Design an enzyme around this catalytic site. Structure first.
Site, short mmCIF file in Angstrom:
data_model
loop_
_atom_site.label_atom_id
_atom_site.label_comp_id
_atom_site.label_asym_id
_atom_site.label_seq_id
_atom_site.Cartn_x
_atom_site.Cartn_y
_atom_site.Cartn_z
N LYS A 11 4.94 -51.18 3.91
CA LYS A 11 4.06 -50.03 3.95
C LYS A 11 3.09 -50.15 2.82
O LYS A 11 3.47 -50.20 1.69
CB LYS A 11 4.83 -48.72 3.80
CG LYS A 11 3.97 -47.47 3.98
CD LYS A 11 4.82 -46.23 4.18
CE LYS A 11 3.99 -44.98 4.26
NZ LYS A 11 4.82 -43.76 4.39
N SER A 27 3.99 -48.85 -1.92
CA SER A 27 2.76 -48.08 -2.04
C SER A 27 2.75 -46.70 -2.64
O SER A 27 1.74 -46.05 -2.55
CB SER A 27 2.06 -48.01 -0.69
OG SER A 27 2.93 -47.93 0.38
N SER A 28 3.84 -46.23 -3.22
CA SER A 28 3.83 -44.93 -3.81
C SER A 28 2.81 -44.98 -4.93
O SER A 28 2.77 -45.92 -5.70
CB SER A 28 5.16 -44.47 -4.34
OG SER A 28 5.01 -43.28 -5.05
N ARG A 67 3.00 -35.69 -6.46
CA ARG A 67 3.61 -36.64 -7.39
C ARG A 67 5.13 -36.44 -7.54
O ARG A 67 5.63 -36.20 -8.62
CB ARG A 67 2.91 -36.60 -8.73
CG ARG A 67 2.70 -35.23 -9.30
CD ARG A 67 2.21 -35.29 -10.74
NE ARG A 67 2.32 -34.00 -11.40
CZ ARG A 67 1.31 -33.16 -11.54
NH1 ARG A 67 0.13 -33.45 -11.04
NH2 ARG A 67 1.48 -32.03 -12.16
N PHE A 92 9.53 -36.59 4.63
CA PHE A 92 10.02 -35.30 5.08
C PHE A 92 11.53 -35.23 5.02
O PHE A 92 12.08 -34.43 4.35
CB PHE A 92 9.56 -34.98 6.50
CG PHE A 92 10.12 -33.69 7.01
CD1 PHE A 92 9.61 -32.51 6.59
CD2 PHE A 92 11.22 -33.67 7.80
CE1 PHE A 92 10.13 -31.31 7.02
CE2 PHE A 92 11.77 -32.48 8.22
CZ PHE A 92 11.22 -31.30 7.83
N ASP A 93 12.18 -36.11 5.75
CA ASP A 93 13.61 -36.25 5.71
C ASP A 93 14.03 -37.34 4.73
O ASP A 93 14.41 -38.38 5.13
CB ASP A 93 14.18 -36.53 7.09
CG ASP A 93 15.64 -36.14 7.20
OD1 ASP A 93 16.21 -35.70 6.22
OD2 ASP A 93 16.18 -36.31 8.25
C1 FMN Z 1 5.12 -34.68 0.06
C2 FMN Z 1 5.10 -36.10 0.51
C3 FMN Z 1 6.13 -36.96 0.25
C4 FMN Z 1 6.09 -38.25 0.66
N1 FMN Z 1 7.08 -39.10 0.39
C5 FMN Z 1 7.06 -40.34 0.83
C6 FMN Z 1 8.16 -41.28 0.61
O1 FMN Z 1 9.12 -40.89 -0.01
N2 FMN Z 1 8.04 -42.50 1.05
C7 FMN Z 1 6.96 -42.91 1.71
O2 FMN Z 1 6.87 -44.03 2.14
N3 FMN Z 1 5.93 -42.12 1.96
C8 FMN Z 1 5.94 -40.87 1.57
N4 FMN Z 1 4.88 -40.04 1.84
C9 FMN Z 1 3.74 -40.57 2.55
C10 FMN Z 1 3.75 -40.25 4.02
O3 FMN Z 1 4.79 -40.97 4.61
C11 FMN Z 1 2.46 -40.69 4.69
O4 FMN Z 1 2.28 -42.08 4.50
C12 FMN Z 1 1.24 -39.96 4.15
O5 FMN Z 1 1.56 -38.66 3.77
C13 FMN Z 1 0.11 -39.93 5.17
O6 FMN Z 1 0.41 -39.25 6.36
P1 FMN Z 1 0.04 -37.72 6.58
O7 FMN Z 1 -1.35 -37.62 6.20
O8 FMN Z 1 0.29 -37.49 8.01
O9 FMN Z 1 0.87 -36.94 5.68
C14 FMN Z 1 4.92 -38.74 1.40
C15 FMN Z 1 3.91 -37.86 1.69
C16 FMN Z 1 3.95 -36.59 1.26
C17 FMN Z 1 2.82 -35.66 1.56
O1 ORO Z 2 7.97 -39.80 -4.00
C1 ORO Z 2 6.75 -39.77 -4.06
O2 ORO Z 2 6.16 -39.27 -5.02
C2 ORO Z 2 5.89 -40.41 -3.02
C3 ORO Z 2 6.22 -41.61 -2.48
C4 ORO Z 2 5.38 -42.18 -1.60
O3 ORO Z 2 5.68 -43.23 -1.14
N1 ORO Z 2 4.26 -41.57 -1.26
C5 ORO Z 2 3.95 -40.42 -1.79
O4 ORO Z 2 2.90 -39.86 -1.50
N2 ORO Z 2 4.74 -39.84 -2.66
#
Ligand code: FMN
Ligand code: ORO
Ligand code: 2V6
Length: 355
Positions: free
Chosen positions: A214, A179-180, A111, A63-64
């Site tokens: 993670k 884990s991305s 993505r 988010f941030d």
């Molecule tokens: C749009 C989006 C961007 C994300 N970007 C990142 C990221 O940059 N790094 C990361 O570790 N996880 C990222 N995540 C994963 C979230 O941190 C989280 O692990 C995942 O969305 C599951 O939680 P939620 O179901 O509450 O969204 C992202 C998720 C979403 C939906």
């Molecule tokens: O930057 C992304 O695409 C991204 C990273 C991540 O860790 N998790 C995710 O769902 N998206």
């Protein structure tokens, strides 16, 4: 209610996901959002990772990304904030469009491919507020920083190293995001993690951030044993379980369901909880877990906590329910702990194992 079926579904019609995200970050930073007034009870306080958390609900990474909204997020009621992922160099990420909403499923597929403003931009911003953060941290409002790697990079360890060197002094905890789904083997993990911990250890007479890893929700049973084995062998401070999933469960109603990417939100919730439960068992309740994936209610949080999580995070719920969800989770969680016989949230951690 105003957020839940007036503002969010409406914004959904008007704004593409990236535009909506960008607006959300800015509005949050500017403090336009009405502030949370719910007061955390002592019952929600958690002490873990060398810090006190006034409540166990944090905002997940993504988010941030760039650390622009940290203060605003605490104001919405989050117990902790995780910034990132941050890449060493700035990068665009994948071609638009790159995020898809499935409102029917209360899920998102993304993505993004690590669009980050890069370390120097995020270091500057975080530094400028470092004093304020020290006070917030002391008040039970910690800051985590999540580190990523650039698309180019062959050398992961070097990218992680820049991140630890640059942002580690600003972090209450650090996360290595391996884990991305949008960008191995025991030995290979072990090497990398050791190099990261070594960078952390070298930090600067900072008294020092905890280091977490993670993980994906899409792992093998042996990898889970492996990750647990390494974490214990290396003394890794924590695990964050989980990132988004590459699966598409039965019953998605969303048109955009076929899109490649990581799925988040409600469809992820049970898979994530399952993953936490194993990891707590494999690690003997000895390694703290931050549980994430599909949390949008107090029960969802409690299930993760009972499964073994010491803390939880959410992101996707905000997209559909808005800022009130943070309070809903805390309020519901407190009510459930009372109903269900726990004196404090801490008493619930690992309760599934107890029986
Ligand atoms: C749009 C989006 C961007 C994300 N970007 C990142 C990221 O940059 N790094 C990361 O570790 N996880 C990222 N995540 C994963 C979230 O941190 C989280 O692990 C995942 O969305 C599951 O939680 P939620 O179901 O509450 O969204 C992202 C998720 C979403 C939906
Ligand atoms: O930057 C992304 O695409 C991204 C990273 C991540 O860790 N998790 C995710 O769902 N998206
Ligand atoms: C309708 C919508 C909302 C949004 N986030 C969002 C989340 C929010 F909390 C707000 C605010 F400011 F109202 F509290 C907001 F304006 C936007 N996202 N974020 C995404 C994305 F890209 F992250 F998936 N798509 C969205 N769609």
């Amino acid at each position: 209610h105003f957020y839940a079926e007036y503002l969010m579904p409406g914004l959904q019609r008007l704004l593409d996901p990236e535009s909506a995200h960008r607006l959300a970050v800015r509005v949050t930073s500017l403090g336009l959002l009405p502030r949370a007034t719910f007061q955390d009870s002592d019952m929600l306080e958690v002490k873990v990772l060398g810090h006190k958390f006034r409540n166990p609900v944090g905002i997940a990474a993504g988010f941030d990304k760039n650390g622009e909204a940290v203060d605003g997020l605490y104001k919405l009621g989050f117990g902790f904030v995780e910034v990132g992922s941050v890449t060493p160099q700035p990068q665009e990420g994948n071609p638009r469009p790159r995020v898809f909403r499935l409102p029917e499923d209360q899920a998102v597929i993304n993505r993004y491919g690590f669009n980050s403003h890069g370390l120097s931009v995020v270091e500057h911003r975080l530094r400028a507020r470092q004093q304020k953060q020290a006070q917030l941290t002391a008040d039970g409002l910690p800051l985590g920083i999540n580190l990523g790697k650039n698309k180019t990079s062959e050398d992961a360890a070097a990218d992680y190293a820049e991140g630890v060197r640059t942002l580690g002094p600003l972090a209450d905890y650090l996360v290595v995001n391996v884990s991305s789904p949008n960008t191995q083997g025991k030995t290979e993990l072990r090497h990398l993690l050791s190099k990261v911990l070594q960078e952390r250890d070298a930090l600067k007479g900072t008294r020092k951030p905890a280091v977490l890893v993670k993980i994906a929700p899409d792992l093998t049973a042996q990898d889970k044993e492996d990750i647990a084995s390494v974490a214990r062998e290396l003394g890794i401070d924590g695990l964050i379980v989980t990132n988004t999933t590459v699966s598409r469960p039965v019953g998605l109603q969303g048109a955009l369901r076929s899109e490649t990417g990581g799925l988040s939100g409600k469809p992820l919730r049970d898979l994530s909880t399952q993953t936490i439960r194993e990891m707590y068992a494999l690690t003997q309740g000895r390694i703290p877990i931050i549980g994430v994936g599909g949390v949008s209610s107090g029960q969802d949080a409690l299930e993760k906590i009972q499964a073994g999580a010491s803390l939880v995070q959410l992101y996707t719920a905000l997209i559909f329910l808005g800022p009130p969800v943070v309070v809903r989770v805390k309020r519901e969680l407190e009510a459930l702990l009372k109903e269900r016989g726990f004196t404090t949230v801490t008493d619930a951690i690992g309760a599934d194992h107890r029986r």
